[PDB]
Amino acid sequence: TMMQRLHLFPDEDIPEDILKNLVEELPQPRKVPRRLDEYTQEEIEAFPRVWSPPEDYRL
């Protein structure tokens, strides 16, 4: 019976009916990490460059 009260949707598309009757938004259990491109230039510039690379090495 309680299995009947669960509604699962593959993407975000939901009938107007179910959208209209939703009370409350639950918090995400896991904290999703950022990628590399997400970081503000402020934040990247703000982070220390840990080692000093040699010049003659090709990268």
Binding site: P33, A46, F47, P48
Partner: protein, 155 residues
Amino acid sequence: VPKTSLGSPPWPDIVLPDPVEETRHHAEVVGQVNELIAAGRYGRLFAVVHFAGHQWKVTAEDLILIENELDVACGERIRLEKVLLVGADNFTLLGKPLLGKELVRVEATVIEKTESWPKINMKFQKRKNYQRKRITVNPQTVLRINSIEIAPCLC
């Protein structure tokens, strides 16, 4: 110390007020609630009582069933003493771990002295030929709770 997902302890930082401001603030708050008690603004009180080995939630006009015989004439007025909680819509008094006598008072009446309905208790054993059947009757006492009064003195 740059920010890595570890080096920062995973929880909100703790903000704890200064003891002085807290002593002032407490003196003040207690003062105010005290003014509410003196004023008579508490609508209806409920209390948490400790009686005959249990804890109960009690309000005027209510009823409880105590599980043993007390020696009291029927109809006498008892004053319950150990009181854990007192509460009202706007405020609540909490004992550590008991509320002082002068602060609150709760008075009940004993209504009914009764013997409980028969409780059937029977032990049994597989093919040992062992049965024991015993019926239990327990003296019980019903209490009407009359009044919860709360005095102005709080400091």
